[PDB]
Design a protein around this ligand. Structure first.
Ligand code: ADP
Ligand code: ADP
Ligand code: ADP
Ligand code: MG
Ligand code: MG
Ligand code: MG
Lengths: 524, 524, 524, 85
């Protein structure tokens, strides 16, 4: 409908004020001494979090022009989270510093577009510098330090995470779930496992809980539902000749087959249990080949040249044992060759290098870990429920941070890396003076993440920065201990990827944001 | 949508005031002299209760920030109820004292994150102390004392509950129902009983009331409904041959089976009555195996290897006698070996140790009680329906408290245990001064439950506390008798579990709550 | 219903003000130093653009009469975009200049109709001048310069665009898609390709990802779907006999045909893969003739005179090899005579000059490019989503501008061409004085685009223009370098078509707009 | 702590008025000893008395004693009385 128009300074002032509100709320959660922010929920109990991105999503302003400024700055915090899942609070601070200084430059009559180019060039130079500074983080102690630092300096979190990454491996999958107790627990899963129950509660091999343990079983994979069509007897009787247990994978099994099966198992003629496939057509069908190849078995292609009783005992896969409960089925170890195992993994490389990334890579990776790596689950400890989400969320941030630290390395924390790189870039200049100022402005903004940490500690942000700048390399001030030294020695580490991403995302929105002459919005 | 934001002290002050309103309403219901709170309902007659958790649920505030404070403290009261079902009012009081002192520390300029750690560390130390103070609750008199104390010092309640736990047993099930009369009454049921009536009103053995008593009957368990499938006559005949009564359990019996059956029972050929299974198929089928094993019978596996005709007379379970009426069927004692009964119970151990807890365990235990234990029902007397609500509610609290006291033991009441443990922890300090203050803050908050009891009695909370602190061991002040002495001697007992849970839940919410810098809420 | 009516002077003032608001918002985005405009969305995050047409669309006014003026000027910006996709901001400026001066003439008591046609005569004369000044632009450097100038002086954009036009050719199709990285990337597609995957994932010729490469394959085109009328064996057998791979194009291929086909391909009997036709009935059927003629094959006309079985091996088309994946099918090169390729293209000439224009020629040309030319895709780099649309939008404007520059040539930029033509037309007069004033008004308005650019920069618009007028030929002022010289040397180019279109569209609406005596609108 | 911390403010105020960093100047001044300090007029560090910037000991004392006297006096005040508009 009809819209309100603001030009130049009036538009920018409202924009900045909106930006300041969002940024101020986000800043208080930054650092070891960072403070919690509570998001009010109508639906249920209020949520308290130290996560800047979570706070950013919630904030919208009554003033349409101020709101627009806040909405645009909101995205940098949101984008940083997508990139690495950490440093979102830090990224917002850089946007605050850049925008305020950029607008100040704009007031002078300097061309904003030139200022943007200066900032962008400064950013590009800064990114290259970060890569040179990044030190590899391949040791468990360093990994623990990043986890601990991400989790608002919780030593126990870093400790548990380090244990898990070493254990699962480089390509393994680690997740976190709410714990029943007040104590944090770690679970490690060995071999292939999936969320399938047994269709025959009656057949329990030994332990109670519906637990089935088959010793050196034959594994069958099929593409069809089994009901009245019994004809598969020569395959099933072949198993009887062997005197070994049979594991069945198919779309479904109904009582007719199960009825004969339960009696056959009861008298010891055959020890056989049947379970349903993984779940969805493109899902379960895709995961069947790997199960079969891993166990050395053959998938029955209903679709291709195969039939229900057309398939010898040769076709069935072999495993030393399987554990089945009402909710899950696990194979101890299917017997298959590494070349086939690795080969299945090798064909997975296209699957791994997929445009979708989110959703596709994590489930896919799960197969990868199940096929050769492993799966780890972490339980979170806390007395009620509000404590549990906060504790849990930070652990995930640490989980994401460690994954990032391993792949791209780490840099000194406390904002020292950005301030240290700024000194390095003091000689960078552009096409004209407006660009030179823009460059210089970006360098100025680099300092802010460091000083927010100090500010939140109730100490002079400027005084600490002057001494830190005075220092060399990794020298910096530890907010927790309230003293100077070497940041790396202390254990305060920033994954290079989050540091890099924060600066780039903050700068990307900020350059365009400062160049806005006119803003348009609807009246109340 | 659009957000209203408060920072620092303004946020915390609003939060505190909201918490104070919630806690003030809760406090008046704490102690022997505690007073009732009336909750209004547009639906019908208002509910009056001394139960703090119920009062907490109903409190919501007009001020959006104040409401946020109250909503967060609401959870500690509610969480405590989930754990033990008692001490919810006491837990709220601890939250009140911890929060007020914690915020005061925050005002001082101390880092709240550190304050939280001090509190959390202090809580862990306090919990360990409670276990050492805790003494076993085994005798009936002590159980009665906890029941009596829980039910706002009602002696009759403690007396009746003690009789029931001893009588039913350690794993027995106790419930409470309203009473027809003005007097409290206890009902105890032994053997296997269920809420199933008879399909044939016509077959009444001796007492009229739909009452069927069969002497040395054979019990039939089935997985199908019998409409036109009257065939099974050789089974029925085998029973006619036996000359013994027949009890029938199956999904349903139609008039066709009943019609022939009625004539057969009336002229003396056979005495047979049929009743429909427990209710829902997974649930009825699950309870059928125990019924058969308990009576030494065999469940007919229509599903597995059994048919309607196929089943010998010996398959049927045996019992001394059964009692049947329109609403319920009861078996005096099925004849089964002690080992088999115990064995079903043994497989139930997985069932007992279930992640579900709520609902699954209650029903599970009921099966277990029927299998080997006993079931008790308590009726509550009162002239009016609302009086009945208050009286009954307190009885349940005592029931939960006794269950808690038996499993985890008891500690001295009147808040003496928390104040007594506080003296012990005077030696606890940590990483920094802010933590030390946080620890100290928690110790001070410990005192509050004791003083609220005294405050509600119209006496100086501080003066009684000074003498209590002055005392040793279990020495304390009895609010009801208005004098000092040994609390254990008095008969005032606090189950260790409720006391521990209250402190833990109160502190966990309080630690995060005191660390809040910014609050977000919707506009008026 | 019930209309508010304004006459003469009051109506025109309201109209002018509405126009001025719209124009002023548009004006700030004109030039190298032009500034961005942010459009607020209730849906997602706000949009930031320098594109005048996008801004014009979003502007609606609270005052009903002013809004009417704004809506009326909105079309000139919208029409310019439709004609060339560039020059929309400039067109609005001309409308601003013409209308303001025209209204002033109206105020004098001059006949508006005479003023309007005087303007129209001047416009027609100005257009003729533009063709004379227009110079060819067939060289890559000049094309790059227009791309760079359109993209708000971004050199990298102009460089990449020039490369694509040269390589795909005159009739090639170029589109732009968001890039995953922070860098710009160019993709070129050669040969015949369509967006359809394979219905047989099982048959992969060599590389994974479903990549199928058939060497010297036969191509089958059909108007059929195949279920159980597999009966095409004589055709399939003929191919088996030849030992060559088969590619199948038809409405659908399913289960039974694929099942047998899969076994045949795996064991080496035949190497055959099938893919679904292009998409919709007439659309896919229309594209079948070209596929078959290109490959030298014959489409199976179910409808005309051919049967499923009926078709010899010669009917099938031949290609060197094809590339197939899960979402795309590509033919390296079908062997077909150029006379046939051009002949297919020749029948396309009617298709090319189709009244539909929008949509029809774009897709039609895509077929054309696939038939003989090439297809190019450009990817745009940016850290965040808001940067991404702005960067990409400008690239599209440049893409459209280059297309316009090639077909109609270019003129010197900075508004120099309009100012230069205006000096030439100083001798143009009409039937009466009122027309003569209108002519003069048009010439006067021509100057404005030049001065608006300078005004955006921050320099005196009149001073620069006075010196520019003093100059000759292509002499002008470069806003970005802040100096005078030859605009062509500089690399500042305006496609003749956008320049011409802006002037004609602005003038057409402006003439009618200044002739308004009375306005009709609804009440508040 | 309130009294000691309050002492710092006049220095900071001097520097703040000048448009210089109060925290940075205060930090460096704290490091020094005796009459060493920052001269706001000349923007440099040295012996303030030698430089020519000084206050009588009596005025500094009197200002500090009165400020504390009134502050404490307000802190202990529980009631205020005035006429309505
Ligand atoms: N104890 C500490 N001492 C000094 N710096 C710290 C300490 N803990 C964390 N930091 C730093 O401050 C930054 C922000 O903390 P954090 O709240 O985790 O923000 P993110 O949420 O990481 O923006 C870190 O990336 C790190 O460099
Ligand atoms: N007669 C009494 N004398 C002293 N203390 C008592 C007496 N009765 C109860 N108390 C104490 O006060 C607490 C609060 O009573 P209650 O109403 O049951 O609150 P909860 O609802 O248990 O907070 C008890 O747990 C107990 O320690
Ligand atoms: N650096 C420059 N120096 C002088 N003129 C320029 C420069 N850059 C662009 N222009 C001119 O100003 C016009 C407006 O730019 P543009 O934003 O693309 O508007 P349109 O969107 O073209 O109205 C161009 O068509 C061109 O002639
Ligand atoms: Mg973090
Ligand atoms: Mg109680
Ligand atoms: Mg343009």
């Amino acid at each position: 409908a009809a819209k309100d128009v603001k030009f130049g300074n009036d538009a920018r002032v409202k924009m900045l004020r909106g930006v300041n509100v969002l940024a101020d709320a986000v800043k208080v959660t930054l650092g070891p001494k960072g403070r919690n922010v509570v998001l009010d929920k109508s639906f249920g109990a209020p949520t308290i979090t130290k996560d800047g991105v979570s706070v950013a999503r919630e904030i919208e302003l009554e003033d349409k022009f101020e709101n627009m400024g806040a909405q645009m700055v909101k995205e940098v915090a949101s984008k940083a989270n997508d990139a690495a899942g950490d440093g979102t609070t830090t990224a917002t601070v850089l946007a605050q510093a850049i925008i305020t200084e950029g607008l100040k430059a704009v007031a002078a009559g300097m061309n904003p577009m030139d200022l943007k180019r200066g900032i962008d060039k400064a950013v590009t130079a800064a990114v290259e510098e970060l890569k040179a500074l990044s030190v590899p983080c391949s040791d468990s102690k360093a990994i623990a330090q990043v986890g601990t630092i991400s989790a608002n300096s919780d030593e126990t979190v870093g400790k548990l995470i380090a244990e898990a990454m070493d254990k699962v491996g480089k390509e393994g999958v680690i997740t976190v779930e709410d714990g029943t107790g007040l104590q944090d627990e770690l679970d490690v899963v060995e071999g292939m496992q999936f969320d399938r129950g047994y269709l025959s509660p009656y057949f329990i091999n030994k332990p109670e809980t519906g637990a089935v343990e088959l010793e050196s079983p034959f594994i069958l994979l099929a593409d069809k539902k089994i009901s009245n069509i019994r004809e598969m007897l020569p395959v099933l009787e072949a198993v009887a000749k062997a005197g070994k247990p049979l594991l069945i994978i198919a779309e479904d099994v109904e009582g007719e087959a199960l009825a004969t099966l339960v009696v056959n198992t009861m008298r010891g003629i055959v020890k056989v249990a049947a379970v349903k496939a993984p779940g969805f057509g493109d899902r379960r069908k895709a995961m069947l080949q790997d199960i079969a190849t891993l166990t050395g078995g053959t998938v029955i292609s209903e679709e291709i040249g195969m039939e229900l009783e057309k398939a010898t005992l040769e076709d069935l896969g072999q495993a030393k044992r399987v554990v089945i409960n009402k909710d899950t089925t696990t194979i101890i170890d299917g017997v298959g060759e590494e070349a086939a195992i690795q080969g299945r993994v090798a064909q997975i490389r296209q699957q791994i290098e997929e445009a979708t990334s989110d959703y596709d890579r994590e489930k896919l990776q799960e197969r990868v870990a199940k096929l050769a790596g492993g799966v780890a689950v972490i339980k979170v400890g806390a007395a009620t429920e509000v404590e549990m989400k906060e504790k849990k969320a930070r652990v995930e941030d640490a989980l994401h941070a460690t994954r990032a630290a391993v792949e791209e390395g780490v840099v000194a924390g406390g904002g020292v890396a950005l301030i240290r790189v700024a000194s390095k870039l003091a000689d960078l200049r552009g096409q004209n003076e407006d660009q030179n100022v823009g460059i210089k402005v970006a360098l100025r903004a680099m300092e802010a993440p460091l000083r927010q940490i100090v500010l939140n500690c109730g100490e002079e942000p400027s005084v600490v920065a002057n001494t830190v700048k005075g220092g060399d390399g990794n020298y910096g001030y530890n907010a927790a201990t309230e003293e100077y030294g070497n940041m790396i020695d202390m254990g305060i580490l920033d994954p290079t990827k989050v540091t890099r991403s924060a600066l780039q995302y903050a700068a990307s929105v900020a350059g365009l944001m400062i160049t806005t002459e006119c803003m348009v919005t609807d009246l109340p």
